């Protein structure tokens, strides 16, 4: 690395076999690949680390402690049943997390880091893993580096240092070799280009690069727990502590009654295992993993887990105009000169193929000096280049070059050679270079400048009319302004071009009409999302009329809408900015600092924002948003790294689905919480009243363990898996607090638990009317509680819908788990060893039917009160 850094580029190409302008032939590519290897360094453990990582959840430690407490008093079946419950919950958590991580890696593999490399001397699009040492690669603005790059030419190259060094300080690269951001001659793995263009050969790939150890370290860190995950860890711990208090009160009431110490210790350990939500963090992890799985199915790369839950709370979606709502395909269509003569331009694309026609006949070369001067100001000025009908740099600069190569003025791009340049910045809104003719070296250098029309007409001094140069006046500014407004209101992006001998001595030449089509599928999407209670906006760097027209064609702009500029948005303080910002749907002439200020102004109001943008201007605002979204086909790698979400199919129907699934996660969680809490309170109050009543306890410790498997295992994880509904999608977005245990939900939980307890007490007292103690009554109440539990599970399947209107075919896992619990209960009734270990004997068919109806009662009452609430809503 350093030895090649102090080595000259010619000596570098002498040490390693390469051609400087023609790249490597594919035979030599395969020859270097057979020895050096691929770009991926070795391999990136699920069998051992991922399975053992689930056992450090605190509720899992406490259930393991209860199991080893049961081991200390040596009952085998209690300990193995607690361990079976623990094994099942960590198994489903591990398999869902593993599947989500594998699908995430598959989708991140599906998009490759693309490279613009000249393998055969022509511009080709290759991947990062296809690169071999010796290949020379062109670097674009906002491109991640393909390999360890040694650059032979660099007119203007800028390399960030935040990837490895961790510093946000800007850094530049020097073409001349340096003896001995350590060395600016050699480009580093992991960095990205923030500005400018350069070309360079590569010295090594894969393991042989020094900077692979930083990537090895960055893979080591685990994903931190989401605020939802910590919140429901708190909820599970507080439910555990409330159940512990209730069970301790039961044990004291039990001690006074004097019931056997060992049997009540088993019943209390069983009740503690049951009522604790061992499956609450596992069901939260299952919901998040399934949400990531759906995002992969919706073609979205989600880097971190909290994005899946913050998309459900989203109520404002900001965006950009080019690259997000318009496809960032730019082409010059109309030319208006400073003379007043107008030209219309032919063709679509970044092509050399088009016609420019004035007054009814075509113009080319140096036929008319105004349009030729405008076109020439559109080739030398652009840093970007067009090679083999492919766009390399930014899409607007290419449009003018496409126009420059349309009119027949390609070679002046090369003839002119620049010395010092003024780079384009989003805050600066203007571009400028001074270059000198190759053939006419005696002629002095002259500056060319392209930028926002207001800044351009501010900077230049004079104008051109009738082929003559005259000083700019106010009426000339007025005619140029009305013309610019006409281009903007027609829907044509405006670039104003001017030329002059020196900066500040420039002269205005005219305008170019750049059109960009709206991205297909955005208008119906934005209509749907606005109909779903979100407020999608438009943050733009372009003019008022362009952004307003594009928002109108897209339907973003109402008939009475307010649009605020950048100077006005930095004029207002934050509170009245927050007041005026929901009315605004079009922001324009906004710098990235303005975009960050809009994002923060909506963030102060409690509104969860989701910036969907593309650009290299400043991706810190994408980190400032609650959700960072970037596009895949036309998306620069800096905003892809900064994004919290990447969509590769580039339709606004997916960000729409992300909010839908983030909403449905909480509904599935509500189903789990309702079901488990209702049966936990039912069993707890059952044991509390009977132990207090002096009656024999209706359920045994093994029976409460089987009830725990029902209440926390796959019958409850099924309710955490249940697919979303379209009607609960149409509900407006919720606040940041989850607000899960609502008053209606707690009322429903108490109603279901009260019906379960009353039915169990009725059957228990009915079998105790003859005042004898037999296992018949305790298996009667065990079967009654188990059937009540599956009926309360079926009642918990949908919060706002009736149990019949949804259907059992929606959730296959619920049907499988219900059938499994029914068959396990019937084996407890029928199998004589299971009869001995559960203190159970067989029952009759009519008794089972009577229990089935008595437990259907809670489902009937549940659908009655849900229909009553729905009719009250109507």
């Amino acid at each position: 690395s350093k030895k090649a850094s102090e080595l000259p580029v010619s000596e570098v190409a002498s040490i390693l076999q390469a051609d400087l302008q023609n790249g490597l032939n594919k035979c030599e590519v395969s020859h270097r690949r057979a020895f050096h290897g691929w770009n991926e360094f070795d391999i990136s453990e699920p069998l051992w680390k991922k399975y053992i990582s689930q056992f450090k959840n605190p509720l899992i430690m406490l259930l393991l402690a209860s199991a080893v407490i049961s081991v200390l008093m040596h009952q085998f079946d209690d300990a193995v049943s607690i361990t079976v419950a623990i094994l099942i919950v960590v198994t489903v958590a591990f398999v869902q997390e593993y599947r989500s991580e594998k699908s995430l890696e598959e989708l991140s593999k599906l998009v490759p880091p693309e490279c613009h490399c000249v393998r055969e001397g022509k511009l080709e699009h290759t991947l990062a893993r296809d690169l071999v040492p010796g290949d020379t690669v062109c670097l674009s603005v906002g491109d991640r580096v393909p390999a360890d790059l040694r650059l032979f030419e660099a007119v203007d190259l800028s390399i960030d240092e935040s990837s490895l060094t961790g510093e946000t300080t800007p850094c530049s690269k020097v073409t001349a070799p340096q003896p001995a951001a350590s060395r600016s001659n050699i480009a580093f793995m992991g960095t990205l280009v923030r500005c400018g263009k350069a070309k360079g050969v590569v010295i090594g790939t894969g393991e042989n690069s020094e900077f692979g150890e930083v990537f090895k370290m960055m893979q080591a860190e685990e994903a931190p727990k989401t605020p939802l995950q910590k919140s429901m860890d708190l909820l599970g711990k507080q439910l555990s502590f409330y159940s512990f208090g209730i069970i301790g009160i039961i044990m004291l009431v039990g001690w006074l009654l004097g019931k056997d110490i060992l049997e009540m210790f088993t019943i209390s350990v069983s009740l503690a295992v049951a009522a604790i939500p061992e499956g609450l963090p596992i069901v939260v992890t299952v919901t998040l993993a399934l949400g990531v799985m759906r995002m992969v199915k919706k073609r979205a790369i989600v880097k971190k887990l909290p994005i899946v839950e913050t998309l459900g709370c989203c109520n404002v979606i900001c965006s950009d105009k080019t690259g997000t709502l318009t496809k960032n395909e730019m082409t010059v269509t109309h030319i208006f000169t400073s003379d007043g003569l107008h030209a219309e331009v032919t063709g679509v694309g970044y092509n050399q193929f088009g016609e420019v026609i004035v007054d009814g006949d075509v113009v080319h070369g140096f036929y008319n000096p105004a349009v030729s001067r405008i076109v020439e100001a559109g080739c030398v000025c652009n840093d970007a280049v067009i090679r083999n009908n492919t766009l390399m740099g930014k899409p607007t600069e290419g449009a003018l070059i496409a126009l420059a190569m349309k009119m027949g003025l390609d070679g002046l791009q090369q003839d002119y050679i620049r010395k010092a340049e003024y780079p384009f910045s989003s805050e600066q809104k203007w571009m400028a270079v001074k270059c000198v003719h190759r053939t006419q070296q005696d002629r002095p250098e002259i500056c060319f400048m392209k930028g926002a029309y207001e800044q351009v007409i501010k900077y230049c001094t004079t104008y051109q009319s009738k082929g003559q140069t005259l000083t700019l006046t106010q009426q000339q500014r007025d005619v140029y302004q009305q013309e610019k407004a006409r281009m903007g209101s027609a829907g044509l992006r405006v670039l104003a071009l001017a030329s002059g001998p020196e900066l500040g001595q420039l002269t205005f030449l005219g305008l170019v009409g750049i059109i960009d089509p709206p991205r297909t599928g955005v208008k119906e999407a934005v209509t749907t999302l606005i109909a779903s209670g979100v407020s999608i906006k438009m943050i733009t760097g372009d003019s008022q009329e362009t952004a307003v027209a594009i928002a109108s064609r897209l339907g973003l702009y109402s008939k009475t809408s307010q649009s605020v500029s950048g100077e006005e948005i930095d004029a207002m303080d934050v509170q009245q900015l927050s007041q005026i910002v929901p009315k605004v749907a079009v922001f324009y002439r906004a710098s990235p600092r303005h975009k960050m200020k809009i994002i923060k102004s909506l963030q102060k109001n409690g509104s969860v924002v989701a910036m969907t943008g593309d650009g290299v201007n400043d991706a810190v605002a994408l980190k400032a948003a609650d959700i960072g979204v970037a596009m895949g086909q036309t998306g620069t790698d800096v905003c892809k790294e900064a994004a919290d979400m990447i969509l590769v199919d580039d339709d606004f129907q997916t960000i729409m689905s992300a909010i839908e699934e983030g909403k449905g996660i909480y509904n599935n969680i509500k189903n789990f919480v309702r079901f488990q809490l209702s049966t936990s309170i039912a069993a707890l109050t059952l044991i509390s009243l009977a132990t207090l009543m002096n009656f024999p306890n209706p359920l045994n410790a093994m029976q409460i363990l089987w009830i725990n498997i029902i209440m926390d295992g796959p019958p409850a994880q099924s309710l955490g898996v249940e697919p979303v509904d379209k009607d609960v999608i149409r509900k407006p977005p919720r606040n940041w607090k989850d607000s899960i245990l609502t008053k209606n939900l707690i009322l429903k939980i108490l109603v279901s638990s009260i019906i379960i307890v009353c039915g169990t007490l009725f059957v228990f007292w009915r079998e105790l009317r003859d005042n004898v103690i037999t296992p018949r009554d305790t298996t009667m109440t065990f079967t009654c509680f188990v059937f009540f539990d599956m009926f309360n599970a079926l009642s918990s399947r949908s919060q706002t819908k009736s149990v019949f209107e949804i259907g059992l075919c929606s959730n296959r896992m619920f049907c499988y788990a219900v059938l499994g619990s029914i068959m396990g209960q019937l084996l407890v009734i029928y199998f004589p060893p299971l009869q001995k270990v559960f203190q159970t004997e067989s029952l009759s068919i009519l008794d089972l039917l009577f229990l089935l109806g008595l437990t259907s009662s809670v489902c009937i009452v549940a659908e009655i009160i849900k229909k009553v609430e729905r009719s009250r809503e109507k």
Partner: nanobody
Amino acid sequence: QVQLQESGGGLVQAGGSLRLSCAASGSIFGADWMGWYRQAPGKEREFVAGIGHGASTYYADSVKGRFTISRDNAKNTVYLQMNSLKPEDTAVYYCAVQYTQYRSYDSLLYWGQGTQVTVSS
């Protein structure tokens, strides 16, 4: 307005011969440019045939000579003749016809839906 429907198109192997045909409902003598634009599967859009007001037929660099254009006025259906295309040169072939507007800065460029050409085997 011009509504564009493409006829005689569909995927063909490398080395084959076929005649494209694009039907335009509107006039051609008032139009500025009758053009054919390619859209490669997975890549950007270029063109394959184009004739404008200046009577200069445009042939792309990949298909110079072997892709040819012919058209008349009354039939309102411009053709495109291609010979021996390449697998990298496959595309969904669009249609584009616009008029000459300087009062109205309107997008008179209308695209057709086109037809897809891809070489795999």
